[PDB]
């Protein structure tokens, strides 16, 4: 029972650097590399008294790789695992997928293949990236295509960052997203999306961080992606493995776009004054402003929901919590899945980083929910894409890389088909 966690782009490598410290603190692994089955999922054992993670950090530019090498987690990671390219992607899907990728995918595929051959209980892979930029779109699509053609049956967990409606970091983000989603629709078994302004607001209103940073944003993301696999890592009363996220939450082979959220989020002084029980966190996770994506769930319906609890929580109180949530009529479930809940529990509680913003809480929950609220966001993305596509804005860079307008049109009609499928299944 293992799984390999690969990272692409600045967002991916920063999330990996922010999360592997949490993993090592959870497993009791010091940064030097030394202190039975809990760490076997993510960390190997090299001979005697030494561990190495099952991860690779790949990026075309070296500005992230050299600082990761010269940081503080130097002795924990394998020096050869940190792959580095030679040229900048420059927010260009074509440049990240065709020119610069082809000279390093040959090494990357061989490296993941040989590090997977020694492994035997690999459940799947999880890829960290961001379609809002160039590297995390192009190289991710390039690797996932030739990974799906080779393995295919094995599961892939995508973790992507998407832009906000009113805010955007780049300017070619809708082109990058609409181009890469045409390939992500068929090869990605399931893909969790996160919005920047939602995760800025969640630490503003609740955690009371007036001036947050990307480290503070990535800490709770690391908590989420550690809590989903905490069931595999540690024993539980009702364990859920990685195949549950494929089997239960993907009712159709192409409708595989769930939203994500987490609770409780609370500062140190507020933790001692707010009580922790299952009811308030269950009410807050379904709260619309508490989500990690700026989408209104009230406009749509929930297709499926998996609740994963951590800490000393009995089954009875969570059963009562989901019962009263079902009787609550503010939310609305789809008629095609009345049994739309999948509850699971792990005994190992959440941990806290020394000096981190998060506080000690006796129990927690992560809520990955498949719903039709993302259809509005996709339609918004296509609407803002069409305005630039009509004027042929930012097209000379792409066509000067090797591509044309044909695959742009195919991306447009594929997004239209996605909207057609979503409005059809939401009826």
């Amino acid at each position: 029972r293992e799984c390999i966690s690969i990272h692409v782009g600045q967002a991916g490598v920063q999330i990996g650097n922010a999360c592997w410290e949490l993993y090592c603190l959870e497993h009791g692994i010091q940064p030097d590399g030394q202190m039975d089955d809990s760490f076997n999922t993510f960390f190997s054992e090299t001979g005697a008294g030494k561990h190495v993670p099952r991860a690779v950090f790949v990026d075309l530019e070296p500005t992230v790789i050299d600082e990761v090498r010269t940081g503080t987690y130097r002795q924990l990671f394998h020096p050869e695992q940190l792959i580095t390219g030679k040229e900048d992607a420059a927010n260009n899907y074509a440049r990240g997928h065709y020119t610069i990728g082809k000279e390093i995918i040959d090494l990357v595929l061989d490296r993941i293949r040989k590090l997977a051959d020694q492994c035997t209980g690999l459940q799947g892979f999880l890829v960290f990236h961001s379609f809002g930029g160039g590297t995390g779109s192009g190289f991710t699509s390039l690797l996932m295509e030739r990974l799906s053609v080779d393995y295919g049956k094995k599961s892939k967990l995508e973790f992507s960052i998407y832009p906000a409606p009113q805010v955007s970091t780049a300017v070619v983000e809708p082109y990058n997203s609409i181009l890469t989603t045409h390939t992500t629709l068929e090869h990605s078994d399931c893909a969790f999306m996160v919005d920047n302004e939602a995760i800025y607001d969640i630490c503003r209103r609740n955690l009371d961080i007036e001036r947050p940073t990307y480290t503070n944003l990535n800490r709770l993301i690391s908590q989420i992606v550690s809590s989903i696999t905490a069931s595999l890592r540690f024993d539980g009363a009702l364990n859920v493995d990685l195949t549950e996220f494929q089997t239960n939450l993907v009712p159709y082979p192409r409708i595989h776009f769930p939203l994500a959220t987490y609770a409780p989020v609370i500062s140190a002084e507020k933790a001692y004054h707010e009580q922790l029980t299952v009811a308030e966190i269950t009410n807050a996770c379904f709260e619309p402003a508490n989500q990690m994506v700026k989408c209104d769930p009230r406009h749509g319906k929930y297709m499926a929901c998996c609740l994963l609890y951590r800490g000393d929580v009995v089954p009875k109180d969570v059963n009562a919590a989901i019962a009263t949530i079902k009787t609550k009529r503010t939310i609305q479930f789809v008629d095609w899945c009345p049994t739309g809940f999948k509850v699971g529990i792990n005994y190992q509680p959440p941990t806290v980083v020394p000096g981190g913003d998060l506080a000690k809480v006796q129990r927690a929950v992560c809520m990955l929910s498949n719903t039709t609220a993302i259809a509005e966001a996709w339609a918004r993305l296509d609407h803002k894409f069409d305005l630039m596509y009509a004027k042929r804005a930012f097209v000379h860079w792409y066509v000067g890389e090797g591509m044309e307008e044909g695959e742009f049109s195919e991306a447009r009609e594929d997004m239209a088909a996605l909207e057609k499928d979503y409005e059809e299944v939401g009826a």
């Binding site: 029972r1 089955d37 209980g121 459940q123 024993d235 009363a237 009702l238 364990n239 493995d241 195949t243 549950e244 494929q246 089997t247 239960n248 939450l249 993907v250 009712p251 159709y252 082979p253 499926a304 998996c306 009995v314 089954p315 009875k316 059963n319 019962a323 008629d335 095609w336 899945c337 009345p338 049994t339 739309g340 809940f341 999948k342 509850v343 699971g344």
Partner: protein, 426 residues
């Protein structure tokens, strides 16, 4: 002499089976290592019915554990009585079923059935005369619902004369911890209704209602529910495990409880169940026990028995008691509630007694009921299955293993036939 083969499948199945082995080992006076330290010779008189004699006055259980993940095996091995089980019987795969009936029945079930078949064959050959195959599984989830059904089918093919007994836990609409649970239930009931001879239908919300109402426990976990179901699992098997003035083996209760081959889904029950602080303020006499046996809230199923009619019930008592009191109590029970018993049977009640009660109690009893009230729990699962199936939802995963929609249609037709069968005799 009338040995019993024990097989355990699924998470909840192996958990309740481990608790069953724990409680019966405590009753027999068996150490966690495996040594005998009992006080009564009757415990050792019928220790061979489950446990196999070993060297050094050691006893090993005739238990088979099968699970499609190593985690359940590690947990039950790390449990209080994990070491008593045979290490050879710990057969298990690598990949889980992922809450899919097709994976458990076709892909990994085919890979593990050949591994478990020779093991159960060896255990059957070890004993002098196998009585029946007792199994525990869950309709919910994929692992139990596929692998236990396939194992039941193969054992039915291999031994078409022996008894097939199952203690099956099934879902409810108020408590449902799985999205593919109506599909798994609808697929598993098609195999259960044709192959198994006996079937005890257990509902989680029924046990939760029990623990809220009569136990009044503050923090009820799965451990309390395991002890609850283990009580009735020991009550059914007490008759062959110890002598009694009127013995009723598994076949004896089956002949009374199974008027037709398909109508064999029972409604188990057990009493006395009370809090530790309210034990002094209750008389344990047989009328106050018998009223609790036939109380609507005391049963281990969510169905209301007053909304239906009993086809037939059986009461297996334990402890010294007066046969006249038992007879007159069952008489007034069947008389004053004549509207709730079918008129086309003169006596809808079976009685049995054992002379050695559980430790810590002076008298006890277990109730096994076959009634038309189970049609409610059947039809709610049927319409839950139909609502998801009518748009072909949650089937692209099932089609990967070669499974067709005609099989789901056949399962739906079987469910319709079963509920109409239960409605016929009402």
């Amino acid at each position: 002499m009338r040995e019993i083969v024990h097989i355990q499948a699924g998470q909840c199945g192996n958990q309740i089976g481990a608790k069953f082995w724990e409680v019966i080992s405590d009753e027999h006076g068996i150490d966690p290592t495996g040594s005998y330290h009992g006080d009564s010779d009757l415990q050792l008189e019928r220790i061979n019915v489950y446990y196999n004699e070993a060297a050094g006055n050691k006893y090993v259980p005739r238990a088979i554990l099968v699970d499609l993940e190593p985690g359940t095996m590690d947990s039950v091995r790390s449990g209080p009585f994990g070491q008593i089980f045979r290490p050879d019987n710990f057969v298990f795969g690598q990949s889980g079923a992922g809450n899919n009936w097709a994976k458990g029945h076709y892909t990994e079930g085919a890979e593990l059935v050949d591994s478990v078949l020779d093991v159960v064959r060896k255990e059957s050959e070890s004993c002098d005369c196998l009585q029946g195959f007792q199994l525990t599984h869950s309709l919910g989830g994929g692992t139990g619902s596929g692998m236990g059904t396939l194992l039941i089918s193969k054992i039915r093919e291999e031994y078409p004369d022996r008894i097939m007994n199952t203690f099956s836990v099934m879902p409810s609409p108020k408590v449902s911890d799985t999205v593919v649970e109506p599909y798994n239930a609808t697929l598993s009931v098609h195999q259960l209704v044709e192959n198994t001879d006996e079937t005890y239908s257990i509902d989680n919300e029924a046990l939760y209602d029990i623990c809220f109402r009569t136990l009044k426990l503050t923090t009820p976990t799965y451990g309390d529910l395991n002890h609850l179901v283990s009580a009735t699992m020991s009550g059914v098997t007490t008759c062959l495990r110890f002598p009694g003035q009127l013995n009723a083996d598994l076949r004896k209760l089956a002949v009374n409880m199974v008027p037709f081959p398909r109508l064999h889904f029972f409604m188990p029950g057990f009493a006395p169940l009370t809090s530790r602080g309210s034990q002094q303020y209750r008389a344990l006499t047989v009328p106050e026990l018998t009223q609790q046996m036939f109380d609507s809230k005391n049963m281990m199923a969510a169905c209301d028995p007053r909304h239906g009619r009993y086809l037939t019930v059986a009461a297996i008592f334990r402890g010294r008691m007066s046969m006249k009191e038992v007879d007159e109590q069952m008489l007034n029970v069947q008389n004053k509630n004549s509207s709730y018993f079918v008129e086309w049977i003169p006596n809808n009640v079976k009685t049995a007694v054992c002379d050695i009660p559980p430790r810590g109690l002076k008298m006890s009893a277990t109730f096994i009921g076959n009634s038309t009230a189970i049609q409610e729990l059947f039809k709610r699962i049927s319409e839950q299955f139909t609502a998801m199936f009518r748009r072909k939802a949650f089937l692209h995963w099932y089609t990967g293993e070669g499974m067709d929609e005609m099989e789901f249609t056949e399962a739906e037709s079987n469910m319709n036939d079963l509920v109409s069968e239960y409605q016929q005799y009402q």
